[model samples]
Target: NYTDYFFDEPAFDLHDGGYVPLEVSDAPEKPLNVPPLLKPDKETATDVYYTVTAEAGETQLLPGAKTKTWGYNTSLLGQTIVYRRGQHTHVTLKNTLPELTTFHWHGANVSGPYVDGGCHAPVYPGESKHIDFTLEQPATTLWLHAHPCPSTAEQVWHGLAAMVIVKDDHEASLPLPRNYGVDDIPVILQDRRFHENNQWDYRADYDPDGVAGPTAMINGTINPYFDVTTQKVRLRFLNGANRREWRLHFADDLPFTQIGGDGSLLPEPVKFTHLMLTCAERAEVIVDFGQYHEGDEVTLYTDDVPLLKFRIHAFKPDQTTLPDKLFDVKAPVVDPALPVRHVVMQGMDEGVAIDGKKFAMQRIDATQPIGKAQYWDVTNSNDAPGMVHPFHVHGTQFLVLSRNGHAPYPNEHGFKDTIGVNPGETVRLLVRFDLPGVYMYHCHIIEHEDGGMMAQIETFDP
Candidate 1:
């Protein structure tokens, strides 16, 4: 019975004059591109090491000329990386691209400024940097993306983004789908405008609000179709687009159960027929196709545009039902001595700023005590008919306390690192940082973030 889109309808991208409506391409249907799991270079009982290269190459996306793109280990969106909880993970960030870039973990709970991989941490051309950190967060679907200031939108446009999966023992003990590539898959949603020679012209399509294209790219595949052979499949959806908000629904209004959010699993599975995701947000949903027989086709859509086609096949029926409870959220007690902090996101395009000021690399905007829980009230001051700003924080996952003095969306009960703030609304979050370092908080709209709608905070040992 949960059929609402769970967002401010007036703030949808469709209302924008510059919105690029996704259109079905004329290309023939092709197998959905599933990014291969990244293999580790070496592994031990306590640690794992791997090398990731940021290189430039070409990919056959359209029927015509190949598209020149960038990736971590492939031509398009890089390989899917898996990180197990409590293991020390080491990564060799290699930059083979012509320019510089930073590997930012969107939902990782590590120290900021460097290990968190913000703009301050960069791997230059032909250079390699090493970073190691022990993961303390639970199982969730995160992401790796370029976070260099002003050029993040441009680099990600070249395909410098990938899916990251965090695993834990508790989630493993559950009877949920865990077979990677067979029943579990990552669906990274993006869009691009191909110009002559099937090339992307970032400058030509640049918008102060956020750049977009009329074409939808799911896991780097166009006009894609997936072979469904399981009764239930876990689809991890990450909205990798710079600005577009995906309002997802299936053909015939097929319902799905959402199990996890950006940083951890929900306390209970929420059934929904329609779900929406803003930029950099992730939703893990399990779809049961037991009702459909062989030869049946199911289509996944965003708004009215068809994005993916799933062809059903004969499979053994899965009669196992989900447990009544999934995850237990242990919220930290907020300190009464600390005052509620207030932040503001204002303007659009070049005028975008946080707290009436632009972002500065060397300047620290605020400070917080490490391991102390506090409340942050972030407000989007845009007028009516304005954009919905997806606010994101680095290094730590937070809990959404309320929205404009009301309870948050039902599906938002899980821990999250990013949340959409509707225009003229105030969203309160219970934020706590475990490690001490500098972290960035800003609008996740790449263009807006690059245009100065960002700031930083330093956590001290006091």
Candidate 2:
């Protein structure tokens, strides 16, 4: 007798491995080891030091049991990197792992293929690569993850990722949550499966297309909870899962206000009961659980599966209401005179391809003029309406023109680095090539991305 899961049809085999019931008990557990706060201070030039090492460490999943996991610094996740705009970022990537891998700065506007750190280049074990480049972009929430050819998803599942923040003077003036681990929490939402040996095996029991897992880990904890020490807390939720699209909502029916999306702030805050996140999408929301008594708990769950439980013990009144407009985002107007490029995203199974071509590391798929804005009609051919492919551009932000003649989601009305193109639907996006660089655009689904649902655009400043 086998029970089928909701996401996937017929329940697959849960290979004989670690099968632990998801549980959350009220035990005086150790203090949750949240990542340290990274402040984006002004720096003329600084050395950005990082090393990719494979080491064994113990991660506390429950109260008493500790699971063995691989990571860079800590057990589960990497460090949070912060830098300001106009600063020269010189990074030394040291690979201490036993395998070959490359680091790709997912959303940063860097020079080209080499410095972009895509899968075209791989740093072997016990080797170090030095990259010196200046940060020339707006203030946005970017990230760095393992991009090793053919094994990017495996390495990422083994805890090889971190959040990178790019700050500017424009972002500094806004009244947003800037605190790292405190009020502004970086929630790396991911799901994982453990083997019987208390070890993670991505290949042993799951599809290479990054299937959804039953266990939800927030900041590296299963069924975890956080104590609300402030009045209004900002949650920077990143849908770090490879395939899962989390429909997140408060268990208490609180109306949270969303201030920003992937690459820019919204025109105005949109209050909602639930926020939806596809793979690799990020949303910043403010949740005010005020005037709660001591020992009150606010459990954060998705699809009724508890992710992070926020216990509102004792906190002062946070009388601060977010400003009506968070930031002044002046999107570039779409020029109708420019040639409209049609990009077709096609395929199923492992044959997913972009523009009818698989991912070629050395190939330049498209070219655009520097400092010129153009419109791209990104469409999907699948028949299912719910089937979504998140389209992401590398070098700049894009304004969603239209989605099948209907307006996009409330949160999507603002500027975006990534957009979802539904099946049989066409999405028009106004994109500007303000920076001269070679950027890769692809679907955000890790499996789909790894399967060559990706392409590159070169912007030349002439």
Candidate 3:
């Protein structure tokens, strides 16, 4: 017989000045069986394309009831876009909804504010925009979402999101897991509010800066389950939640190996029993279940919630091991004599602010010399001691220098496009501007980012 764990109050509170401790549920001795490939067909090496729409539809999440929701390709979520690195990637975005939206390539090292597709640009309804760019970066987990002004949080809550994978020759040569939808899986972690009518209501529990939900959904499915076929499997996890931070762990104290992070692969694989994922962060890990047997089940739980149940199945053992170094990352040097720029984050009720100023769509806050390295000190001014904020910069990757006079987290040892700055701590980062373009820097907390906790910086050759 199988037993399930339940919690009385599973909500995470930020205003209460406390964080909820996560609990891990128990599972069977063996692993579960994952399903076959569903959306992304990864058989050929070609530049694939997609046409997404911000349209409204209905989906029956609960039994015998339909909920009105919005989506990109399908009813609730968009389609997965897969492409090779050297190929010229092209996408024709058709906005058929009642409002305007923009596509922001979250982790791709693209050039500028126009092509970056943040809140600076917008595509109105009945308009089609063509975006063509080449993926020059290494293999990393990336995503595309609606970047509409003031409505990004609401639109994303309705499920207008998708995943994009940038593949290259180097990644294809590795001995790592590569079977999409079989041994490899993509998990989009998000939360939603289901009304009594079975419809997803965002306005009911909306804040000016962000929104939070009680129900957790993975790949647009609630309480999802997958089958485990191979002895080892790879999982790409993305924190798509608005405000909550997920402390993910495997049942039975299983240790997994982390291969990649937000921008690129790490220097070496780091094994950990528990992984913490903040908002908009990504982590790719491989779990080996060689000790399990056929017909047994193992539950993959996070924060005490069962995300997916893996049913062990019969499969041949083709033993393969990942390499020591995953990718070759070029770390840009920093100048110690450069002028230090300090950015202060402050706010409470409405939203946070940087340097006591809100985000102006057309104004340039700071300018830097192109090809010159600088130092930045981003500090969080919250009185609450344990509050954590994700600080992200556009256009270039930065090396963290210090965090309250101590070293940063274990996963932040490489070149990072984003870093988490805890409360009352000043994070020093080494930054170099190689590309000349107008870029925006802000907190990755979706609500704080949209609520004026952001600023813009332009880079130019001296």
Candidate 4:
């Protein structure tokens, strides 16, 4: 049984002085908020159109006052968006916030520069932009958030993040749970600090490493619990926090099957009693609750603090079984003519940088030919007791080759866009860009990324 976290224990965030330990809130338990599926404004046989509006609003997250927050089309995290494979998806991004923001699709595998929605594509207040692209990636969990250079952490903390679900025929044929709000749920793991008026003060609570709060917010609900109406439930867990890493485990050490990662389904389902997710990472796990009876409550915790509760109720037995093979991941061949590219994540706080320099909007750090595969060695230069940095690259999903010359973790056999690199560790990835454009790659710790631990690469058709 996989009961322990795969990464080195000493390098956990708990060792950092800036780490914010989560605390149990005295607020009453509330039903977990499931984001509604965004209905397309228009749809045809081969295309879909949607309008995502980023607006500022107040949400009642505490007992006394409402929290002033920002979100996409909602008061909190935006509605869940669904994209089908091979469909031309057109999105109208509107910004109603007082400041400028960019709608960065975290792992959609679309072309970059503008459509990929990095810092270069920003929608000013009261302005709107239209972008269209064909969905050509595997069916998995992706996310959309604000990525406006140094303000990304502050904007995301204000609640500009949303979930994007990709679907394909291969994954549709699988016997996995597909029911949106009932049997399947999205668990957005985040934290927030309530101020005097039950609001959030980003600058006051900001740390260069990361910003965190003591209260756990699951899908915008504080101290939330979900009703389990099915014998088997699928949980799509997304680490939406600014810098926190979740070491997730269930009550009584309930074993669960992990079927998918950030970008796609694993080749095989792996069983584990414990799992870890760094910032911006996603894990899809299915839990069997046939052993538990009605009125039983199962607690899901990060470290020792309870995050979510599963209340067992009347349910029908799900006899569905997962096959030995889930999805096939064919690794692309690397080019012998091109040497391995090196990326370094170093320093901390204001000194955090990539390759010893800060990110410049006009500067392109490197370039690789489209349709060619290359090895990227991403190294975290932090020494012992340093926090693990989650490395992420936009516009492409890559395969992890090794960790410091050793084989990758068992569940890393699928495509991934974000990976956690331990202190003083180098994680090698087989990366290829099918679309030609510029894409940003950086540490997923929102604060560090904003503090200059980021770089961009231009992919061209040679």
> Candidate 3 vs candidate 4: which has greater TM-score?
4
Alpha-carbon local distance difference test for all models:
0.92, 0.71, 0.72, 0.92
- Give one digit per residue, the lDDT tens place, for model 3 in 1-462: 311211012222343443333322232222222222224322345554555556778875555577776767667776667756777666677787777887778877666776677877688889988777677667778878777667678778877877767777877887788798888888888877677877777777776545666666777775667787898888988888776777677787678888878777776788878777777878888988887889987777775666677778986886788777777766666665568999888774466789989898788999888778888999888774335677888776677778876776667666677776767879888887666778888877777877888898988886
Error of 4 at 401 (Å): 0.9
Residue lDDT tens for model 2, 228-315: 7887888887877777767677777777888878777777898987666767788888888885677887766665566677877677
After superposition, candidate 1 runs with Cα above 4 Å error: 1-3
Provide the lowest-lDDT 10-residue window in model 2: 4-13
Q: Residue 425 error for model 1, in Å? A: 0.9
lDDT string, candidate 4, 1-462, tens digits: 434999888888888887789999999999999999999999997989999999999998989888999999998889999999899999999999999999999998888879999999989999999999998889999999999996899999999999999999999999998899998999999998888999999999998878989898999999899999999999999999998889999869999999999999999999998999999989999999999999999999888988899999999888889999999999999999989999999988889999989899899999999899999999999876777999999889999999999999988999999999998999999999999999999998999988989999999998
| TM-score of each prediction | 0.99, 0.87, 0.88, 0.99
lDDT tens digits by residue: candidate 1, 138-219: 8999999999986899999999999999989999988898888888999999999999998999999999899999999999
Clashing pairs in 1: none
**TM-score of model 1 (CA atoms):** 0.99
lDDT of 1 at 34: 94
